[PDB]
Design an enzyme around this catalytic site. Sequence first.
Site, mmCIF file in Angstrom:
data_model
loop_
_atom_site.group_PDB
_atom_site.id
_atom_site.type_symbol
_atom_site.label_atom_id
_atom_site.label_comp_id
_atom_site.label_asym_id
_atom_site.label_seq_id
_atom_site.Cartn_x
_atom_site.Cartn_y
_atom_site.Cartn_z
ATOM 1 N N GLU A 141 0.687 -1.261 0.038
ATOM 2 C CA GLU A 141 -0.035 -0.048 0.092
ATOM 3 C C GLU A 141 0.971 1.430 -0.181
ATOM 4 O OE1 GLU A 141 -3.042 0.559 -0.639
ATOM 5 O OE2 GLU A 141 -4.289 -1.475 0.409
ATOM 6 N N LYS A 209 -15.305 -7.040 3.881
ATOM 7 C CA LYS A 209 -14.216 -6.051 3.594
ATOM 8 C C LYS A 209 -14.319 -5.442 2.466
ATOM 9 C CE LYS A 209 -10.360 -4.202 4.270
ATOM 10 N NZ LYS A 209 -11.048 -2.932 3.819
ATOM 11 N N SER A 210 -14.318 -4.333 2.182
ATOM 12 C CA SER A 210 -14.381 -3.476 1.228
ATOM 13 C C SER A 210 -13.195 -3.022 0.600
ATOM 14 C CB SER A 210 -15.338 -2.090 1.209
ATOM 15 O OG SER A 210 -14.840 -1.275 2.285
ATOM 16 N N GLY A 211 -13.028 -2.307 -0.755
ATOM 17 C CA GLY A 211 -11.793 -1.731 -1.126
ATOM 18 C C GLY A 211 -12.121 -0.816 -2.216
#
Length: 263
Positions: A141, A209-211
Amino acid sequence: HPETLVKVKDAEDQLGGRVGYIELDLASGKILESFRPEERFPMMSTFKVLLCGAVLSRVDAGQEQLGRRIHYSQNDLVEYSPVTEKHLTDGMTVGELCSAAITMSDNTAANLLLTTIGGPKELTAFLHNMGDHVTRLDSWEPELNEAIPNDERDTTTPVAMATTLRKLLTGELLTAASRQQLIDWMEADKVAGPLLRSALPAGWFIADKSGAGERGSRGIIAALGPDGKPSRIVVIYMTGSQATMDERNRQIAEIGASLIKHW
Ligand SMILES: *[B]([O])([O])[C]([C]C1=[C]C(C([O])=O)=[C][C]=[C]1)[N]C(=O)[C]([N])C1=[C][C]=[C][C]=[C]1
Ligand SMILES: [Ca+2]
């Protein structure tokens, strides 16, 4: 609300780019319905669930402890680190880092955890080793959100991600305690309100869980079901449009409303 596959195709019609979707039965693993199941999409922050799977695997192997406190510097901080940026003095435990990475999408927390397992290369090996020969993490990241190039880097497919999530949550790969901790983190998700959660009826269980990424990229992975227990896995990814955040959120929520209505 229209039939789910019709709604998915409609979302793609409105957004442009591609939308991918799969729904799995949690108990049996059978595919209930899909769209673009085998095409690649950027994982974005959804990878953080697989990362913590790998961390839990090391805990199960006696190579890691969730209570282990990790310290770091301001120089370690990258964008979107709402939790880690607040603990520069006291640091955070491995378990706290996983909670931050999953529930708040914390990037530095993910990077710190990647370090513990030996980097994106080792996450990919962990996946390969549990039978996922598709999903790959190549970057840290916040570079992994580029959604191209370069070019299949940092990607999964809906069916790969769904199958792997199922194995992590219900398979004998992790101990019962570890499977439970992973889903507990996902159940406590704080930043996916406007997505599947927005269409969720009272009494339902969801762990998700998102993104989000560049180039119109958005995604969510979820275990959800009625009566306070999960019974199906849902994975939705989208990429390659110029859609605003709000519009991408809306389409995902609408796909959610559809799959709930037509459960
Ligand atoms: B990620 O998706 O790998 C990461 C953090 C992030 C997660 C979410 C979510 O819904 O879980 C969202 C928004 C950001 N994404 C990024 O670091 C990416 N550069 C980014 C950051 C802010 C807004 C869009 C994309
Ligand atoms: Ca189409």
